Design a protein around this ligand. Structure first.
Ligand SMILES: [NH3+]OP(=O)(O)c1ccccc1
Ligand SMILES: O=P(O)(O)c1ccccc1
Ligand SMILES: [Ca+2]
Length: 534
C-alpha cells in the first residue's frame, strides 16, 4: 500500500523549544513522534517563511520558484525579475499537484504565504480541500485593527485573510484561534476522506509566529517559568542539548548579539512583560502540539499512523526581530500599537495584545548557532526536524546528516511511486528539483542523502551563504556584519565563530565559484539596500 503523508510546519519555532530537542515547553505529542522517529540536527530551510514554503512544495530553490525575496518587501530593481513574482510561479509544479494526479487526496489547513490571488491559492495549486490563512501572518484570534492609510505597513500586510477552497471567508467562527481552527479543519477533512485512498495532509501552523497569543489557561501553566530570563534559558537549553546528544559536549556557542538591554539591566515591569511574552510563546507551542496530537491520535485510532510518513519541521530560525526597528513596517508601529492594543502585563497573549519576544529570547532557542531568522548563518537556516515512519529502517536515532527542505518533494514522490515529470508539465517548461530523495538514506542503504561535495546556496535580504560538504561561507552586509565573506568549518565550529577566510583562502575561493554558479542557476538578484534598520 502507498503511504499517506503528514507534513507539519511550525512557524518561527526555534531549534531547542520542543521537549525532544532540549526544551522545557510541554510537547508530548511531538516528543513521541521525535523519539520514535529520526531527529535531524543538520536539516536546513531558507531564512524566512515564504522562501522556505516555496522550496518545501517544489524541491527547488526559492529564487526559481517565485519567492526570490519576500513579497512584502519587493523593491523596483527586483520587480519583474524571473522568480521574483512574490507568489509560487508557473515555472514550477507543486508536490500536491503531482500527488493529486496520482490518486492522492490533497488536504491543507494552515498558513499559505505563497499568494493572495484566486489563481495562487491552495485550491489553485493542487489541494482538493484547504482552509488557509493566505498572508504571512495575522491576529490568531481574528481581531483586526482599523485599516487605513496611516495603519503600519506590517499590519496592513497581515489581515486575517482566510479562504476555504475557492471561497474567501467573510467571517470567522466564534472562538476562532488559529492553531485550533487548523486542527479542527484538518481533522474534518481527514474524517471526511475516502478511506480507500491515501492522503497528503499539509499542516502549516501560524504559531508560534507573532503576535504572541494563546489561550489564557495554557499561558497560566508557564507562570513564573521564565523569570530568570533569556540568558538563563539559553544555558538550560545548551545543557540539555548536550545531555541529549543533539550537540557535542564541547561545542562553543556563538555569543548573543542584541541591541536591546540585557535582562539584569531591565526594570522590574519591563522584565515582567518580557517574561510574560515568553510564557505566551510557550503556550503557543504547547497548544500547537495539542492540535498535532488531535490529528495524530485520530490517524492512530484509524490504524493509519504507521502507514503515514510524518514530517515535522520549523520553517526558519527562531524570530529575533524587533519589528519596531524597521521603518518599512511603520510608520510609527509602536505608537499605533499603544493606541489600539493593550500590552500591559495582564493582557499580553490575548486577542487585543500585539507582542514579539525579540532577539534575546530568540537566541536562547537557536543556540549554539549564530543569530536567528532572516540571517543566512546557521541560526537562521538550521531548524528542528523529525521523520516518523516505521517502514524506514533509520528510526529511533539522532542524525547529524546534512539535509534540506528541497529534499522533501523528491522523497515524497519516491515513496508515492510517482516520477517527477521532468522539464515540462501541463505544457509549460518547469524546473526540476535541486534536492535529493532521502529514501536511500532513511532505508539504511546510505549514511546520508548528500556528501562532502554537495553544494547548496542561500541568498535573501542581501545576505548570502554557500556550503559544500561541511564547509560554509557566509556574507552578512552592514550594519549586521563585516560585508565580507567569512568561512567556517561547520564540523569543528557549528557556532560560526572562527573565520577561516585568511587561513584557508583556497577553500574560500572555491566556495565563491560555487556561489556564482548558484546565483547563475537560480536567478539571484541583489538590490541596492539589503534592508534598513533604524
Ligand atoms: N560555549 O558555553 P557555555 O558553557 O554554555 C557559556 C557559559 C557562560 C557564558 C557563555 C557560554
Ligand atoms: O517572513 P514572515 O513570515 O516573518 C512575514 C513577513 C511579512 C508579513 C508577514 C510575515
Ligand atoms: Ca516563519
Amino acid at each position: 500500500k502507498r503511504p499517506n503523508f503528514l507534513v507539519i510546519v511550525a512557524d518561527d519555532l526555534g531549534f531547542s523549544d520542543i521537549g525532544a530537542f532540549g526544551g522545557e515547553i510541554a510537547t508530548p505529542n511531538l516528543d513521541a513522534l521525535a523519539i520514535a522517529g529520526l531527529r535531524l540536527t543538520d536539516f536546513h530551510t531558507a531564512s524566512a517563511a515564504s522562501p522556505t514554503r516555496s522550496m518545501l512544495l517544489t524541491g527547488t530553490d526559492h529564487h526559481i520558484a517565485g519567492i526570490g525575496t519576500v513579497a512584502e518587501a519587493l523593491t523596483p530593481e527586483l520587480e519583474g525579475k524571473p522568480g521574483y513574482e512574490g507568489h509560487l510561479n508557473e515555472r514550477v509544479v507543486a508536490l500536491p499537484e503531482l500527488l493529486r494526479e496520482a490518486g492522492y487526496q490533497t488536504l491543507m489547513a494552515g498558513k499559505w504565504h505563497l499568494g493572495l490571488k484566486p489563481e495562487q491559492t491552495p485550491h489553485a495549486r493542487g489541494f482538493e480541500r484547504s482552509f488557509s490563512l493566505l498572508p504571512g501572518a495575522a491576529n490568531h484570534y481574528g481581531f483586526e485593527p482599523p485599516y487605513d492609510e496611516s495603519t503600519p505597513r506590517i499590519l496592513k500586510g497581515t489581515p486575517a485573510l482566510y479562504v476555504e477552497d475557492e471561497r474567501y471567508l467573510d467571517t470567522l467562527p466564534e472562538g476562532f484561534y488559529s492553531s485550533d481552527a487548523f486542527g479542527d479543519k484538518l481533522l474534518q477533512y481527514l474524517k471526511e476522506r475516502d478511506q480507500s485512498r491515501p492522503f497528503f495532509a499539509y499542516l502549516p501552523f501560524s504559531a508560534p509566529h507573532w503576535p504572541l497569543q494563546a489561550p489564557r489557561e495554557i499561558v497560566e501553566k508557564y507562570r513564573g517559568r521564565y523569570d530568570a530570563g533569556p540568558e538563563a534559558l539559553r544555558q538550560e537549553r545548551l545543557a540539555r542539548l548536550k545531555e541529549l546528544g543533539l550537540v557535542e559536549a564541547d561545542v562553543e556557542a556563538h555569543p548573543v548579539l542584541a541591541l536591546t538591554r540585557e535582562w539584569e539591566a531591565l526594570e522590574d515591569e519591563e522584565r515582567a512583560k518580557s517574561a510574560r511574552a515568553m510564557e505566551v510563546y510557550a503556550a503557543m507551542v504547547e497548544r500547537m502540539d495539542w492540535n498535532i496530537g488531535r490529528v495524530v491520535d485520530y490517524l492512530r485510532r484509524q490504524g493509519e499512523l504507521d502507514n503515514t510518513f510524518v514530517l515535522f519541521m520549523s520553517d526558519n530560525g527562531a524570530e529575533g526581530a524587533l519589528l519596531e526597528a524597521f521603518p518599512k513596517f511603520g510608520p510609527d508601529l509602536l505608537d499605533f500599537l499603544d493606541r489600539h492594543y493593550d500590552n500591559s502585563l495582564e493582557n499580553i497573549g490575548s486577542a487585543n495584545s500585539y507582542v514579539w519576544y525579540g532577539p534575546r529570547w530568540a537566541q536562547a532557542a537557536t543556540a549554539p548557532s549564530r543569530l536567528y531568522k532572516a540571517f543566512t548563518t546557521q541560526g537562521g537556516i538550521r531548524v528542528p526536524a523529525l521523520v516518523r515512519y516505521p517502514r524506514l529502517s533509520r528510526q529511533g536515532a539522532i542524525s547529524h546528516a546534512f539535509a534540506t527542505v528541497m529534499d522533501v518533494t523528491p522523497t515524497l514522490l519516491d515513496l508515492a511511486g510517482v516520477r517527477h515529470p521532468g522539464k515540462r508539465w501541463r505544457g509549460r517548461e518547469i524546473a526540476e528539483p535541486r534536492g535529493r530523495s532521502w529514501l536511500g538514506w532513511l532505508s539504511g542503504e546510505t549514511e546520508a542523502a548528500h556528501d562532502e561535495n554537495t553544494v547548496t546556496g542561500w541568498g535573501l535580504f542581501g545576505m548570502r551563504a554557500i556550503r559544500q560538504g561541511d564547509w560554509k561561507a557566509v556574507y552578512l552586509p552592514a550594519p549586521v556584519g563585516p560585508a565580507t565573506w567569512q568561512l567556517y568549518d561547520l564540523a569543528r565550529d557549528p557556532g560560526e565563530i572562527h573565520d577561516l577566510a585568511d587561513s584557508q583562502p583556497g577553500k574560500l575561493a572555491e566556495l565563491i565559484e560555487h556561489w556564482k554558479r548558484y546565483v547563475s542557476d537560480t536567478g539571484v538578484v541583489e538590490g541596492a539596500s539589503p534592508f534598513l534598520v533604524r
